[PDB]
Design a protein around this nucleic acid. Sequence first.
RNA 1: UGACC
Lengths: 138, 154
Amino acid sequence: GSMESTQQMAVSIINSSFEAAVVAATSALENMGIEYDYQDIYSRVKNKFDFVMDDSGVKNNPIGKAITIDQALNDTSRPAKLDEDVNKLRMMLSSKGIDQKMRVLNACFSVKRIPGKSSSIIKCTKLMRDKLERGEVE
Amino acid sequence: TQQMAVSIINSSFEAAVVAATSALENMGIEYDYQDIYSRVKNKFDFVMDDSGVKNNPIGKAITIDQALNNKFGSAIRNRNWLADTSRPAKLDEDVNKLRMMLGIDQKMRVLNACFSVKRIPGKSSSIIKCTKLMRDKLERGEVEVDDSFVDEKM
RNA sequence: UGACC
């Protein structure tokens, strides 16, 4: 059930770009203090984005290539949606002022007070452990 | 494909601008095109760059181009990654961490003093840097940082 | 030369 791995990956290019745009738009207005309706900005972005990419062949084209690739190579559905959600959440957070340094460290470590002491306890989470099994700079 | 991905990314920016700009007008709120254009552009450029997401799609577009030039190595890697038995578990843990983020000040103060976050050019993932002392200490278990050291580093 | 935050 992985015989569409390339097409699934290729769609995240369109979908993640779309999500980036919604975030950019809603976030900018928000930073201006202007009140707005999420669905309204969401719909306007989709209207413009869909018209340009989905009517100029640049989605039918990318997908077509992805399909040509999957045939040559020839479930995976769940891990692809989650891949897309990771891009979305990161961007949503990024837009709010919680950059990468904050996200990486907060996700890689848990920190505790330590009661009758003037120090903190740091522990690696599963994400940090996997990085070690891969690569962390000494 | 890479040029198409770039194209799609720019069309996305155009959409964010038209959405904000058209949203202000529909609500009877004045605005200068250049002003709104600039605001959306800083946010979009910052978001796409800081998220590592720009590198993700341009990177993905590049492995398709390669597969089109008969170098399926990367595409093969893409299928194996998505097929890994623990892929969903790993992304779920990833996604869960980020969603809980939507405090952390004290936590960041301590962390900002012991670790540095970097990025390998082109990559969407990150690189964490520390001292061999910390690394070896971490590669053993819990680690106590003294509130004095942190302060020694702002 | 994306693979994870």
